[PDB]
């Protein structure tokens, strides 16, 4: 298969390895008590939390983010973070997403003993700010739910395990004029079975895929480990979001299609 190396980033079960809609793929002990926490290795572009107050406010009059500190480590700009770690060569040059992830993982809630609990974070591309999330909960149907939304399009949900080479091994852009397929005997065949959801544009298709994707918590043993309906073939002409749950192994050239994933940005194409 000539597509092997290229299609590696779309093996979400392998490269991400956790829930996407709701990421709770690991556990960590804080002062004698185990807690669930995000552990996906890829960044989730466009993911935010809808409260039914925005969730990026510091922790009903508060949100999910870290409370004010001295000095202020949350929220912290990209330049603020690079200046903060200017003596650390292993950190200061990290990309904005990994750096935000490592910055959040630098704060230990257990001030008595070193623990494994590392807070998730959201990087806002709009004002280049890293928000450390004090609340790792993602759905409770004080009710809230995870979603991709126009308001969240510049948000990026980051677990503690976001790899520093996500640009190389994780999805971001949607593939224009391309259709996910399965490589069989020297040819890229169509996904034999897909679940068709109607969608007005690419954004709504990406939104639908996210809603159906790998989740580590049932809506309304729980770990998905990356398994789920993570991919979608969007036919822009028929306005169909063709959603499936098996990894694609090749691409098909088709001008009517845009290949998207639950991890991918809801707008960007290449």
């Amino acid at each position: 298969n000539p597509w092997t190396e290229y299609m590696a980033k779309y093996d979400i079960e392998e490269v991400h390895g956790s829930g996407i809609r709701v990421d709770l793929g690991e556990d960590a002990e804080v002062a004698g008590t185990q807690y669930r926490l995000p552990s996906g290795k890829c960044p989730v572009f466009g993911k935010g939390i809808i409260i039914e107050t925005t969730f990026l406010k510091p922790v009903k009059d508060g949100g999910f983010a870290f409370p004010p500190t001295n000095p202020l480590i949350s929220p912290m700009t990209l330049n603020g973070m690079r200046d903060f770690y200017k003596n650390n060569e292993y950190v200061k040059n990290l990309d904005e997403l990994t750096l935000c992830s490592r910055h959040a993982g630098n704060m230990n809630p257990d001030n008595d003993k070193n623990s494994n609990y590392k807070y998730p974070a959201v990087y806002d591309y709009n004002d280049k700010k890293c928000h450390i999330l004090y609340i790792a909960a993602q759905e409770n149907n004080f009710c809230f739910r995870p979603a991709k939304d126009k308001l969240f399009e510049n948000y990026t949900y980051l677990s503690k395990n976001v790899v520093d080479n996500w640009e190389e091994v994780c999805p971001r852009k949607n593939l224009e004029n391309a259709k996910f397929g399965l490589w069989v005997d020297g040819n890229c065949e169509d996904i034999p079975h897909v679940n068709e959801f109607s969608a007005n544009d690419l954004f709504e298709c990406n939104k639908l895929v996210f809603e159906l994707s790998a989740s580590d918590q049932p809506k309304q043993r729980y770990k998905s480990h990356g398994k789920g309906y993570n991919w979608g073939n969007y036919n822009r002409e028929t306005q169909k979001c063709e959603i499936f749950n098996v990894k694609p192994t090749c691409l098909i050239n088709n001008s009517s299609y845009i290949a998207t994933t639950a991890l991918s940005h809801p707008i960007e194409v290449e």
Binding site: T69, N108, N111
Partner: peptide, 13 residues
């Protein structure tokens, strides 16, 4: 209050 894991370790409250 939190504790920085990386050097220098310090307490941020």
């Amino acid at each position: 209050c939190f504790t920085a894991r990386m050097s220098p370790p310090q307490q941020i409250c």
